Amino acid sequence: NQIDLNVTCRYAGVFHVEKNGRYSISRTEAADLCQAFNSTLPTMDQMKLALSKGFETCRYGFIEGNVVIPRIHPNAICAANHTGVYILVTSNTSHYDTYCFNASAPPEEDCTSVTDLPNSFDGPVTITIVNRDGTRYSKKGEYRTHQEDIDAS
Amino acid sequence: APAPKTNNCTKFSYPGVSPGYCTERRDMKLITKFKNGTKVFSCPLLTDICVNARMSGVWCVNNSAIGSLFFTSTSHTPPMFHGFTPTHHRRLSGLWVDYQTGYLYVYPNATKKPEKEIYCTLTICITAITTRR
Ligand SMILES: *[C@@H]1O[C@H](CO)[C@@H](O[C@@H]2O[C@H](CO)[C@@H](O[C@@H]3O[C@H](CO[C@H]4O[C@H](CO)[C@@H](O)[C@H](O[C@H]5O[C@H](CO)[C@@H](O)[C@H](O)[C@@H]5O)[C@@H]4O)[C@@H](O)[C@H](O[C@H]4O[C@H](CO)[C@@H](O)[C@H](O)[C@@H]4O[C@H]4O[C@H](CO)[C@@H](O)[C@H](O)[C@@H]4O)[C@@H]3O)[C@H](O)[C@H]2NC(C)=O)[C@H](O)[C@H]1NC(C)=O
Ligand SMILES: *[C@@H]1O[C@H](CO)[C@@H](O[C@@H]2O[C@H](CO)[C@@H](O)[C@H](O)[C@H]2NC(C)=O)[C@H](O)[C@H]1NC(C)=O
Ligand SMILES: *[C@H]1O[C@H](CO)[C@H](O)[C@H](O[C@@H]2O[C@H](CO)[C@H](O)[C@H](O)[C@H]2O)[C@H]1NC(C)=O
Ligand SMILES: *[C@@H]1O[C@H](CO)[C@@H](O)[C@H](O)[C@H]1NC(C)=O
Ligand SMILES: *[C@@H]1O[C@H](CO)[C@@H](O)[C@H](O)[C@H]1NC(C)=O
């Protein structure tokens, strides 16, 4: 099996992770993914600080306690032309992307390549980090601690 | 030609969705069918809710977007259509979007099962209210 993880630059430590090119991360997998990056699900305050430093996406992703989308510039297909952090009302079983907060990141924008999942563990999956510059970093292992996430493929 | 008939404002909030929140639905409504077999579909708008909100629709054909729609509503008016933006590079085969309404015409040769292969992803976001920290 292969898992591809597309990662953005970090803004006040917050970054966006998309798995396998589609909305595919469960609530339980999201926290495990951030922890494999030595990171945590952001608080809303952390997300708002990231937004003030230049962070926006056009994707829903988990934070602590909610699924959200951060917007700086109005775009009609990203939270329907709104700005700010908007919260998605959703079932707890739906899959999205995830956001993560790294406490050792710089306060501003950090676009250096991410080269490892430092807290991955043993397993059979080839896990590939895909950076904005096109470089990719692969290792064999696992990061999911919930068997339900592994069984759901 | 099919076009929305504006309903009276019946509700002034969106059930279960507060300012600062969005919700998404993937569905479509059959607006009309013609004697020639062509069907006309719409995004699944709730047409009697007058709340300050903005909405996007995306026409999804076999899980690929063909273009997007923008709407707004207010305390004074139900959802109002503000245009379609195509995103497809190939010409559509057996499909045509009416730029005046955002409705999707499906000619009979496009597919035998349009209801299974096509939907609109409709996202409604209830506009945040300005308050103090
Ligand atoms: C099954 O039957 C149904 C019901 O009959 C058919 O449904 C019809 O579908 C066609 C499309 O396939 C629709 O026609 C298109 O309508 C566009 C919108 O028209 C309205 O708005 C404009 C602008 O406000 C008005 O000008 C129009 O006025 C016309 O109609 C009124 C009365 O309704 C008349 O009084 C006028 O004289 C006009 O005739 C409407 O109010 C319209 O923009 C579009 O027109 C373009 O395409 C045609 C050729 O297809 C050209 O003649 C025209 O000049 C336009 O050309 C532009 O686009 C083409 C296409 O890319 C380019 O090649 C050109 O260079 C140019 O850029 C067209 O008329 C129609 O509305 C709809 N009818 C109903 C009742 O829903 C189904 O098609 C049929 N199914 C099948 C498989 O046949
Ligand atoms: C969505 O995808 C299906 C599957 O590819 C399309 O079904 C095909 O339609 C063509 C029509 O030209 C037929 O020749 C094929 O035999 C169909 N394949 C299958 C597997 O059914 C369908 O047309 C697509 N829908 C739209 C609206 O594009
Ligand atoms: C002001 O009070 C409001 C409740 O009456 C609310 O808590 C608001 O917080 C903002 O609410 C928005 C939705 O209307 C968004 O969710 C936004 O992210 C959120 O900060 C309060 N405003 C402030 C600036 O604290
Ligand atoms: C609005 O309400 C009136 C009074 O009940 C009704 O007669 C009319 O048909 C409605 N108008 C619209 C545009 O729905
Ligand atoms: C279907 O019908 C439309 C309208 O006449 C035409 O443009 C298209 O080429 C036809 N063929 C297919 C395979 O959709």
Side-chain angles (χ1 to χ4, degrees), chain B residues 17-24 26-33:
Chain B
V17 187
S18 293
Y21 293 70
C22 309
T23 195
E24 294 209 324
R26 289 173 167 76
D27 198 8
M28 64 182 181
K29 176 186 173 73
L30 184 67
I31 298 296
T32 202
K33 184 179 181 186

PDB file of all heavy atoms in Angstrom, chain B residues 17-33, unseen atoms left out:
ATOM      1  N   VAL B  17     -27.511  25.748  11.190  1.00  0.00           N
ATOM      2  CA  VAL B  17     -26.263  26.336  10.707  1.00  0.00           C
ATOM      3  C   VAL B  17     -26.220  27.805  11.118  1.00  0.00           C
ATOM      4  O   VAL B  17     -27.022  28.613  10.632  1.00  0.00           O
ATOM      5  CB  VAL B  17     -26.105  26.194   9.189  1.00  0.00           C
ATOM      6  CG1 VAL B  17     -24.730  26.671   8.765  1.00  0.00           C
ATOM      7  CG2 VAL B  17     -26.338  24.739   8.750  1.00  0.00           C
ATOM      8  N   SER B  18     -25.270  28.157  11.998  1.00  0.00           N
ATOM      9  CA  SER B  18     -25.105  29.480  12.586  1.00  0.00           C
ATOM     10  C   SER B  18     -24.176  30.355  11.747  1.00  0.00           C
ATOM     11  O   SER B  18     -23.409  29.860  10.915  1.00  0.00           O
ATOM     12  CB  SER B  18     -24.508  29.342  13.990  1.00  0.00           C
ATOM     13  OG  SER B  18     -25.421  28.709  14.882  1.00  0.00           O
ATOM     14  N   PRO B  19     -24.209  31.671  11.953  1.00  0.00           N
ATOM     15  CA  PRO B  19     -23.222  32.549  11.312  1.00  0.00           C
ATOM     16  C   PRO B  19     -21.807  32.069  11.609  1.00  0.00           C
ATOM     17  O   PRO B  19     -21.493  31.654  12.729  1.00  0.00           O
ATOM     18  CB  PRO B  19     -23.505  33.920  11.944  1.00  0.00           C
ATOM     19  CG  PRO B  19     -24.968  33.847  12.302  1.00  0.00           C
ATOM     20  CD  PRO B  19     -25.210  32.423  12.734  1.00  0.00           C
ATOM     21  N   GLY B  20     -20.949  32.106  10.582  1.00  0.00           N
ATOM     22  CA  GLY B  20     -19.595  31.582  10.680  1.00  0.00           C
ATOM     23  C   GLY B  20     -19.467  30.123  10.315  1.00  0.00           C
ATOM     24  O   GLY B  20     -18.359  29.569  10.406  1.00  0.00           O
ATOM     25  N   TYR B  21     -20.563  29.475   9.923  1.00  0.00           N
ATOM     26  CA  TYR B  21     -20.570  28.062   9.592  1.00  0.00           C
ATOM     27  C   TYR B  21     -21.078  27.858   8.172  1.00  0.00           C
ATOM     28  O   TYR B  21     -21.841  28.674   7.641  1.00  0.00           O
ATOM     29  CB  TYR B  21     -21.470  27.255  10.553  1.00  0.00           C
ATOM     30  CG  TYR B  21     -20.978  27.174  11.993  1.00  0.00           C
ATOM     31  CD1 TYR B  21     -20.992  28.284  12.824  1.00  0.00           C
ATOM     32  CD2 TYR B  21     -20.529  25.971  12.517  1.00  0.00           C
ATOM     33  CE1 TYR B  21     -20.554  28.202  14.143  1.00  0.00           C
ATOM     34  CE2 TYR B  21     -20.094  25.883  13.833  1.00  0.00           C
ATOM     35  CZ  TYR B  21     -20.104  26.997  14.631  1.00  0.00           C
ATOM     36  OH  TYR B  21     -19.664  26.912  15.946  1.00  0.00           O
ATOM     37  N   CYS B  22     -20.661  26.748   7.574  1.00  0.00           N
ATOM     38  CA  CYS B  22     -21.130  26.320   6.266  1.00  0.00           C
ATOM     39  C   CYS B  22     -21.677  24.904   6.357  1.00  0.00           C
ATOM     40  O   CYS B  22     -21.369  24.149   7.288  1.00  0.00           O
ATOM     41  CB  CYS B  22     -20.003  26.291   5.224  1.00  0.00           C
ATOM     42  SG  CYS B  22     -19.003  27.785   5.077  1.00  0.00           S
ATOM     43  N   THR B  23     -22.464  24.524   5.355  1.00  0.00           N
ATOM     44  CA  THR B  23     -22.871  23.134   5.201  1.00  0.00           C
ATOM     45  C   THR B  23     -22.941  22.802   3.719  1.00  0.00           C
ATOM     46  O   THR B  23     -23.161  23.685   2.886  1.00  0.00           O
ATOM     47  CB  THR B  23     -24.185  22.838   5.944  1.00  0.00           C
ATOM     48  OG1 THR B  23     -24.362  21.419   6.052  1.00  0.00           O
ATOM     49  CG2 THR B  23     -25.368  23.449   5.225  1.00  0.00           C
ATOM     50  N   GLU B  24     -22.716  21.528   3.386  1.00  0.00           N
ATOM     51  CA  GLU B  24     -22.659  21.083   2.006  1.00  0.00           C
ATOM     52  C   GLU B  24     -23.688  19.990   1.753  1.00  0.00           C
ATOM     53  O   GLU B  24     -23.974  19.163   2.629  1.00  0.00           O
ATOM     54  CB  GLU B  24     -21.270  20.549   1.646  1.00  0.00           C
ATOM     55  CG  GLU B  24     -20.170  21.587   1.653  1.00  0.00           C
ATOM     56  CD  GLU B  24     -19.040  21.265   0.677  1.00  0.00           C
ATOM     57  OE1 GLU B  24     -18.701  20.056   0.506  1.00  0.00           O
ATOM     58  OE2 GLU B  24     -18.499  22.221   0.063  1.00  0.00           O
ATOM     59  N   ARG B  25     -24.225  19.984   0.536  1.00  0.00           N
ATOM     60  CA  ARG B  25     -25.161  18.965   0.086  1.00  0.00           C
ATOM     61  C   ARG B  25     -24.790  18.573  -1.333  1.00  0.00           C
ATOM     62  O   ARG B  25     -24.410  19.427  -2.137  1.00  0.00           O
ATOM     63  CB  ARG B  25     -26.594  19.499   0.085  1.00  0.00           C
ATOM     64  N   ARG B  26     -24.892  17.285  -1.644  1.00  0.00           N
ATOM     65  CA  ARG B  26     -24.618  16.788  -2.994  1.00  0.00           C
ATOM     66  C   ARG B  26     -25.902  16.160  -3.523  1.00  0.00           C
ATOM     67  O   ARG B  26     -26.269  15.048  -3.119  1.00  0.00           O
ATOM     68  CB  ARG B  26     -23.452  15.803  -2.999  1.00  0.00           C
ATOM     69  CG  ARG B  26     -22.119  16.468  -2.744  1.00  0.00           C
ATOM     70  CD  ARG B  26     -20.991  15.460  -2.592  1.00  0.00           C
ATOM     71  NE  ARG B  26     -19.692  16.127  -2.650  1.00  0.00           N
ATOM     72  CZ  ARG B  26     -19.165  16.845  -1.663  1.00  0.00           C
ATOM     73  NH1 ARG B  26     -19.820  17.000  -0.518  1.00  0.00           N
ATOM     74  NH2 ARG B  26     -17.982  17.421  -1.824  1.00  0.00           N
ATOM     75  N   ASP B  27     -26.577  16.861  -4.427  1.00  0.00           N
ATOM     76  CA  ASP B  27     -27.880  16.421  -4.927  1.00  0.00           C
ATOM     77  C   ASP B  27     -28.233  17.308  -6.117  1.00  0.00           C
ATOM     78  O   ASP B  27     -27.479  18.215  -6.485  1.00  0.00           O
ATOM     79  CB  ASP B  27     -28.929  16.480  -3.803  1.00  0.00           C
ATOM     80  CG  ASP B  27     -30.180  15.643  -4.086  1.00  0.00           C
ATOM     81  OD1 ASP B  27     -30.228  14.881  -5.079  1.00  0.00           O
ATOM     82  OD2 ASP B  27     -31.127  15.738  -3.278  1.00  0.00           O
ATOM     83  N   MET B  28     -29.371  17.019  -6.741  1.00  0.00           N
ATOM     84  CA  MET B  28     -29.923  17.915  -7.749  1.00  0.00           C
ATOM     85  C   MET B  28     -31.417  17.652  -7.865  1.00  0.00           C
ATOM     86  O   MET B  28     -31.908  16.582  -7.485  1.00  0.00           O
ATOM     87  CB  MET B  28     -29.213  17.800  -9.108  1.00  0.00           C
ATOM     88  CG  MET B  28     -29.342  16.447  -9.795  1.00  0.00           C
ATOM     89  SD  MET B  28     -28.404  16.456 -11.335  1.00  0.00           S
ATOM     90  CE  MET B  28     -28.777  14.784 -11.906  1.00  0.00           C
ATOM     91  N   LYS B  29     -32.134  18.651  -8.358  1.00  0.00           N
ATOM     92  CA  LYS B  29     -33.586  18.615  -8.483  1.00  0.00           C
ATOM     93  C   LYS B  29     -33.967  18.673  -9.955  1.00  0.00           C
ATOM     94  O   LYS B  29     -33.443  19.506 -10.703  1.00  0.00           O
ATOM     95  CB  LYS B  29     -34.184  19.822  -7.753  1.00  0.00           C
ATOM     96  CG  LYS B  29     -35.681  19.995  -7.873  1.00  0.00           C
ATOM     97  CD  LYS B  29     -36.061  21.308  -7.207  1.00  0.00           C
ATOM     98  CE  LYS B  29     -37.508  21.661  -7.418  1.00  0.00           C
ATOM     99  NZ  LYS B  29     -38.430  20.800  -6.617  1.00  0.00           N
ATOM    100  N   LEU B  30     -34.891  17.802 -10.372  1.00  0.00           N
ATOM    101  CA  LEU B  30     -35.418  17.859 -11.733  1.00  0.00           C
ATOM    102  C   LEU B  30     -36.416  19.006 -11.830  1.00  0.00           C
ATOM    103  O   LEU B  30     -37.504  18.949 -11.244  1.00  0.00           O
ATOM    104  CB  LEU B  30     -36.065  16.526 -12.114  1.00  0.00           C
ATOM    105  CG  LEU B  30     -36.566  16.458 -13.564  1.00  0.00           C
ATOM    106  CD1 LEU B  30     -35.402  16.494 -14.554  1.00  0.00           C
ATOM    107  CD2 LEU B  30     -37.418  15.188 -13.788  1.00  0.00           C
ATOM    108  N   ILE B  31     -36.041  20.065 -12.553  1.00  0.00           N
ATOM    109  CA  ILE B  31     -36.907  21.230 -12.702  1.00  0.00           C
ATOM    110  C   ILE B  31     -38.002  20.969 -13.726  1.00  0.00           C
ATOM    111  O   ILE B  31     -39.182  21.255 -13.488  1.00  0.00           O
ATOM    112  CB  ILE B  31     -36.066  22.463 -13.102  1.00  0.00           C
ATOM    113  CG1 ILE B  31     -35.030  22.812 -12.020  1.00  0.00           C
ATOM    114  CG2 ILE B  31     -36.964  23.638 -13.427  1.00  0.00           C
ATOM    115  CD1 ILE B  31     -35.650  23.243 -10.681  1.00  0.00           C
ATOM    116  N   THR B  32     -37.624  20.457 -14.895  1.00  0.00           N
ATOM    117  CA  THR B  32     -38.609  20.137 -15.913  1.00  0.00           C
ATOM    118  C   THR B  32     -38.053  19.050 -16.816  1.00  0.00           C
ATOM    119  O   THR B  32     -36.851  18.769 -16.840  1.00  0.00           O
ATOM    120  CB  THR B  32     -39.035  21.376 -16.719  1.00  0.00           C
ATOM    121  OG1 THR B  32     -40.320  21.148 -17.325  1.00  0.00           O
ATOM    122  CG2 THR B  32     -38.018  21.692 -17.802  1.00  0.00           C
ATOM    123  N   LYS B  33     -38.965  18.412 -17.538  1.00  0.00           N
ATOM    124  CA  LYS B  33     -38.610  17.502 -18.613  1.00  0.00           C
ATOM    125  C   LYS B  33     -39.448  17.877 -19.820  1.00  0.00           C
ATOM    126  O   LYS B  33     -40.630  18.192 -19.681  1.00  0.00           O
ATOM    127  CB  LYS B  33     -38.865  16.050 -18.239  1.00  0.00           C
ATOM    128  CG  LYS B  33     -38.415  15.080 -19.323  1.00  0.00           C
ATOM    129  CD  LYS B  33     -38.667  13.656 -18.902  1.00  0.00           C
ATOM    130  CE  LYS B  33     -38.199  12.696 -19.971  1.00  0.00           C
ATOM    131  NZ  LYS B  33     -38.573  11.300 -19.618  1.00  0.00           N
TER     132      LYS B  33
END
